[PDB]
Amino acid sequence: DNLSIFESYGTALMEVVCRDACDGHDIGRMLALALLDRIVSVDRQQQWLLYLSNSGYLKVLVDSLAEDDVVLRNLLTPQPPLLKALYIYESKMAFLTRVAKSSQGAIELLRSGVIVRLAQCQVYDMRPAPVERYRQILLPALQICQLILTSSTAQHLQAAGQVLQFLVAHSDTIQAILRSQEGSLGSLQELALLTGIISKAALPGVLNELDIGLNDGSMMELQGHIGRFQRQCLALLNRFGGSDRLRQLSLQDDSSRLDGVSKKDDMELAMQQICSNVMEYCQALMIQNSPSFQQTVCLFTLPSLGVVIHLLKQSANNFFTYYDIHRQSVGKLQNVEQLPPDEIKELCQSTTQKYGLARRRLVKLINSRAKLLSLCSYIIETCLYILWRHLEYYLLHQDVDTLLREGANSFGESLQKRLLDIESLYCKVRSRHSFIQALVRRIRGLL
Amino acid sequence: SFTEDITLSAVMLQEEDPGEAATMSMYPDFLKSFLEHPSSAVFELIEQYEATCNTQITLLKKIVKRVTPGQQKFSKTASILWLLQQEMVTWRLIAALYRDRIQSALEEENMFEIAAPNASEKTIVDKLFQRDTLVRQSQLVVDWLESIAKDEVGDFSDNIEYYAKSV
């Protein structure tokens, strides 16, 4: 009914409010952008969104982002002249983020060249409070990009190409962030989103069709970025897959509140995400690339290939770690679920809103846990498929030592109950018999 | 066709319940299909009602499969998907039984031979194929239920072959 009233006025009220949100002054602009952000969210019809696009206000708002490069340069100062600009920027990025959540909105933003304009901004290359502020800029920009494209339609795949162009245009800053040994959850989120974007954008099919006008070189640049992504992705196994896991989880125990608990939860999220995406990427590369099947060169005795064995050892070790943690997280989630309306009454003996917030915290727990679940399901699957075909190939073509190590670890895979609650929530068991067939091919191969 | 399908899918994404609106849009199509063709061959009409249900069931199955397990928002859509499946299979049942009962009424016209020299089963059944108004129909119910189970591909089958190769 509210939308019918907004329409009823005609494109007249929408034009005046949207124009004033663009270039009014300070407060009014911020509030007008917030209002636009809120109205576009309840725009099921998406009429307001159509008007903004047809009247050119959306383009003006996107063009106005180039204005903040000078503001950011002035802000990196110890003393800030006015935080008003930061709030306008936030309202603006919030509104754009809302528009990007729409399947169509993401397309319209891509038509308007939002990623191209972000790629031209030099503020992203000025990595130094000031460091926190660079951090926040990065946050909004990258935000919009990733969210958009991801929630973006399958037809708009170039989204991945444009985002990759953005990552490559700022390769120094991105590599610096991927090399930063930071236990902060934020850094993990940055890494999770970036690894997700790289997993979808860095398809060797995008580098071959990019040779039409950029040509022999654009391919090398593409291969170069991909090779870096590969090395940085493998380095993550030593950080998150080694004895340093306990130190990252212990330095945050000097102070663990509900906040710290959830932080660790999403640290696990990252661990999960950053790589599910990377594993997906590996699987996709193998199914299309097929692991250099055409090449007859021995895979096992510039890069190195024991790297594969290391990765195998590491992934086999990480699997058990992830599995134990996943199982522990599920128990905590079950305990949180146990708590009823009766628990709120016991607390009262506000207790009710304590339970409102309690439910909040516990459902955040649920989120993180289920996330972890899917993550590890996928992890297992990947390890398997890979190792399976790997050893298939190896067979014909060291083998005794590998087989002995494999048999010992495989027995020790005990859990060796593979579970069935995530599986009972998910559809059919592709961990069961698909994994069982993988075991017949591999454990039997080890035998 | 790809532009019209994208616009309709995008319009339904603006409705507060895409499942309820997808059920409502079929009401005129069901009436139209009932009216359209002649009374003498309604069957083709029922086969078209089944096809219309199957089209929306296929769409709703794609929607329900894309949803992350645990959103209470899709419980109503999953119930409507089941009810539309029940509608589709009820049309299939009506087509099978009313064709067959109608077939006996307008076709058991020819006849007639009592017993056979052979004790062979085939000859006994060919002679008694006409003669039972209960049996034939019981086998049509079996064939109908076997057709439902055939449509219902539980499909780990190929991966089940992967699960245990002939070996």
Partner: peptide, 13 residues
């Protein structure tokens, strides 16, 4: 959605 797509691919395998 990505996890669901991977599960569907595994089922197809």
């Amino acid at each position: 959605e990505q996890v669901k797509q991977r599960v569907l691919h595994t089922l197809l395998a």
